[model samples]
Target: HHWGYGKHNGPEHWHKDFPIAKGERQSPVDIDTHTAKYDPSLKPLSVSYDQATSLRILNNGHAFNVEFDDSQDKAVLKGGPLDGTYRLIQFHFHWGSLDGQGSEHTVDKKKYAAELHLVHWNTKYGDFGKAVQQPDGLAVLGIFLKVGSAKPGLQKVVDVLDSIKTKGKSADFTNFDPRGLLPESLDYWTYPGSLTTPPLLECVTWIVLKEPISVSSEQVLKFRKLNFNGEGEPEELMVDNWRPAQPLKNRQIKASFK
Candidate 1:
């Protein structure tokens, strides 16, 4: 038996199995900008992604992920509340059944159409598996998606979805820079949080961008076409994969921009 986004095994019930689901620094908190303290000391984010390091894309049942080669320092994230370099591992997205609600993190209690997560792990920890056990182990760059113009960069990713419609399916996805999908303004809010999934490791330093990237309604719906079920199994739409906002409790969200 596996856990999923269904009514009986969804996020609300994850605490029963993964006790960390109720941890103090859980992710996807409601970010009230007005209350977020401005921290001029925060450094600007620095990202360098090697297009050649982009290995392949896979439909992992829960979401579509573009995995990268992190064996070397080919693609790395530095600065921005980080002490050392963090290697880019993979990037994925979370969406909803409809266009109005999808993103995990909300601003002023407003949800976007979708959310993109660029996952990375600290170099100090060696591998991702080992990194998840420490507090300053992972760094996830979160980008919100709004309904508007179709993003050409996203279209490249969307084109490969048809090939990996089933679970455990993957396709070659090389020469694509994940940085191209980011917003112009790197201004963001930073906080300590956990992965919005099983194992819910409270090891990530969430850097959610203030500006959202644009995506067409058609493009947004294309994500919904993905089936959570594998071959021959009952097909289920892969939507509403976002976890609800957790309690902020004693947490202070620091902003790079006032």
Candidate 2:
């Protein structure tokens, strides 16, 4: 029905349907630190999250998303490369079938076990739907996931994965602070890019962290067990749901730290 991460309908074929898929500012580009410029003018990011704002987790036939209540400014991100406060809406992940081949953006051509995307919408534009259409509407904080010790914060997320293993399935998930999932250093690379998904709106101000959070091999494997198909449909493993790095074109990746 819609686009998917299959050999026939995957990233390469998206441009055929969504013309912007091949736009100049497509995301998930490789971050070549050596080439990224150090900008001292960029302010440190301001992030505040209300653990109670966490609503539910769903398998949206694309990826498992942890939805948040954006009705108020309970969870908000500001400062950094952002011009206004961005309300946290949801957070999801992109991973692969194997340990060393996941993640959307790469560092020096090295891929991590997985990647986490914290989606937010600018309040100046009103709602997410409206904000996504503007030039500076969204801010996605990208966190790299490396395979190692099991992450306690992620354990809470993984524990509920079984309940939403199939597409369209969801579970009540709350009282969880996503900040627990972030790495210590907030040093990051900021750039202008489009959504890695369809419609591929080129309105995202990407803030990809330099440090990677840890996850266990066992926990990483659990993600692959998820099905992209809905109930009564043939099962399709939800693995390798990452898009390859796009060309940087003429954009410059600004770093918050040297």
Candidate 3:
């Protein structure tokens, strides 16, 4: 069985294949507000993305990702905990079957309906593959999604979910500006962490936003409709596709806000 969010091959079993899963600085750590220190030195995060940079949306078996055209710095994320320019290559989400819990990162044990990861790679490394080897190779902006009214920006992403229902399925998704989906405030917690998924490389600088965006319950169901299986395989719902909080270890979480 490959690595997935299934009972047999989920996070608990990932360590067998990816020993780094047990390494330090693993992602999706619970952010205890009382413990995370507010660092005034941290700068506000700034992002500039070109609408035309959006390429397509695809279901990569485990999760669906909205890919972008990262051949250059047309879409870039700067400031915050980042020291260099990181290009937005793709963005994806993890959600639970129910609204009670789903987000990868938690705020004092509170789980949101879902979580979004904006994956970016440092231009200093020349390419994403090379960046993966460095500690600060990737910058992942984690945003929580709470249950509320419909989010117009988010609706656009869900509207096309039906087209990529099965694993390996994909469709062109251009001229979309995801910045509209972001919360008003960019205040966030910064920390050194790894990818929540397998390979679990400790190359990510995580910035978990303080405020969460609202998404209707019906919108979350659209994510559940995605299949973990590809063509000809028995349909298995892709629910609870998130890694639970991992150990914080020797890392210190920093906050950009007081």
Candidate 4:
């Protein structure tokens, strides 16, 4: 947990060791919706998570991982900006201390309360380790969470945070379907980006949805109740755990919606 979002090692300091943190195609870039070029060439994102199964939830000292079991290998994501099929591994949320601002990717300088990332790896690469090294290795679907009516599905995970209040804590989180957390529309902005965390590999094909999923303010507050420190360590509330939006260099953001 040393390379954390804590005071001593925040996003600005990540570049020290993970030099790629400052490399081109780094993620959490602000999407200027008005400037996003519309492209008919992009296919509609195809997702089938109905057969997906969640195993557990844990405070990974970073984000809560709603780990998935792909043993039978049914769940998949393809189409959209992705060239090949990807297997869903895990999906997590990046939130803030409060509801004002927490989302990593913004729209026209607008920040949402939280964001959901569904991480998937290219099946063509054999395994996650090898996939993460290739430029087209991963396809991450980003969904923004805005404060609104309570999302009953999200509450399922929020209810378990108290059990895993510190780093490395995990709780049984079976029977949860991650598809429930996704927004109805797949309208998104596609771009080449990198992993938001360490090693900061520039291997992700970012698919950020336009329509945000709504969740209650009470739910997001639960995310802050977690501790970045593990059990027995100095209790540090897990807040502002999101990486700031990086600059958009020579990259172009293409939209599936007109």
**Predicted candidate 1 versus true structure: per-residue lDDT over 1-258, tens digit per residue:** 678898888999999999989889999899999999999999999987754288899999899999998998888889998889899999999999988899999999999999999999999989999999999999999999999999888888988888998899999998887777988999999999999999899999999999999999888888999989997899898899999899998899999987
Q: Give me candidate 1's TM-score against the actual structure.
A: 0.98
Per-residue CA lDDT of model 4 for 1-258, tens digit only, reads: 368886788998899999999888999899998899999999999998988988988888888899888666668999998888999989998888878888999999999999999999999988889999999999999999999898888988989999999989999988898878988899999999999999899999999999999998888888888888889999998888899999899999999999
Give stretches of model 3 more than 4 Å off.
50-52
Worst 10 residues of 3 by lDDT: 46-55
lDDT of each: 0.92, 0.92, 0.92, 0.91
Give the per-residue lDDT digits (tens) of candidate 3, residues 27-74: 889999999999999999987775438889999999999999999778
Between candidates 1 and 4, name the one with more favorable lDDT.
1
State the TM-score for model 4. 0.97
Which residue ranges in model 2 land beyond 4 Å of their true spot?
Answer: none
TM-score of each: 0.98, 0.98, 0.98, 0.97
Residue-pair clashes per candidate: 0, 0, 0, 0
RMSD values, in order shown: 1.0, 1.0, 0.9, 1.1
Off by over 4 Å in 1: 50-52
